[PDB]
A paper describes a structure:
DARPins are small binding proteins (14–18 kDa) designed based on a consensus derived from naturally occurring ankyrin repeats. Broadly neutralizing DARPins (bnDs) bound V3 solely on open envelope and recognized a four-turn amphipathic α-helix in the carboxy-terminal half of V3 (amino acids 314–324), which we termed ‘αV3C’.
Crystals of bnD.8 and bnD.9 in complex with linear BF520 and [name] V3 peptides diffracted to a resolution of 1.22 Å and 1.17 Å, respectively, enabling a detailed analysis of the [name]–V3 interface and definition of contact residues. In both the complex with bnD.8 and the complex with bnD.9, one face of the α-helix, including the 312GPG314 turn, was buried in the [name] binding groove. The most buried residues include P313, G314, A316, F317, T320 and I323. Both bnD.8 and bnD.9 binding are facilitated by several hydrogen bonds with most relevant sites shared; for both DARPins, T320V3 interacted with [name] residues D67 and N/R69 (bnD.8/9), and G314V3 bonded with [name] residue D104. Bonds between D321V3 and A316V3 with DARPins W46/R80 and S102, respectively, are unique in bnD.8, whereas Y318V3 with K113 and I323V3 with Y13 are unique to bnD.9. The N cap (amino-terminal ankyrin capping repeat) of bnD.9 is clearly visible in the crystal structure of the V3 peptide complex, but no defined corresponding electron density was observed in the trimer complex, suggesting that N cap displacement may contribute to epitope accessibility. Overall, the αV3C proved to be an amphipathic helix, with the hydrophobic face oriented toward the likewise hydrophobic [name] binding groove, thereby allowing multiple hydrophobic interactions to contribute to binding.
Numbering used by the authors:
A (entry chain C): 310 to 329
B (entry chain A): 3 to 162
Write the structure that this text describes.
């Protein structure tokens, strides 16, 4: 999944954006 | 319905439709169940003119999604320098922390954007801010081997 560490919140938002 | 169309217009770079929707009463601060606004989407996808129109018509420059991500976080990570500059000029919080504790400076360092790092620093980005993993932007630049960014972050820290 999203790897745990720096950037994880950014990547989670990016993934959500990718599903719109 | 107008808010969903406005989100989609921002996503797909539909500048003229953004103008039309807001003339017809669309909420410039429309927000989805993830906390994402039109301004977030325009910042992420690099739609500079849409960023400008949204701000002119009242978009909250500092909107946080459900993960604490702001439009500035997204533009900084995605390498959109002019958008970064426009957001800062409009009052964007340079040191906004997302739910991982990352600031725009952390993300600009993570994705290796030298001039974005420099602009953030000139607007007061905090070299001492640590994310929830104990990392400053400098630590991130060391971890990803970006010597130029590490050098400018170390200089900023020394001259603070
Ligand atoms: Mg997806
Ligand atoms: Mg450059």
């Amino acid at each position: 999944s999203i790897r745990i560490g720096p950037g994880q919140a950014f990547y989670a938002t990016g993934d959500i954006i990718g599903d719109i | 319905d107008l808010g969903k169309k406005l989100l989609e217009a921002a996503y797909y770079g539909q500048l003229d439709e953004v103008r039309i929707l807001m003339a017809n009463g669309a909420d410039v601060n429309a927000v989805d169940v993830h906390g994402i606004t039109p301004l977030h989407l325009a910042a992420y996808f690099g739609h500079l003119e849409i960023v400008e129109v949204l701000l002119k018509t009242g978009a909250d420059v500092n909107a946080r999604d459900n993960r604490g991500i702001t439009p500035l976080h997204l533009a900084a990570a995605m390498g959109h320098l002019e958008i970064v500059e426009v957001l800062l000029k409009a009052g964007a919080d340079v040191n906004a922390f997302d739910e991982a504790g990352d600031t725009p400076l952390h993300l600009a360092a993570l994705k290796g954007h030298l001039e974005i790092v420099e602009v953030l620093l000139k607007h007061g980005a905090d070299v001492n801010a640590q994310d929830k993993f104990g990392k400053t932007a400098f630590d991130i630049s060391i971890d990803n081997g970006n010597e130029d960014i590490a050098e400018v972050l170390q200089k900023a820290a020394k001259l603070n």
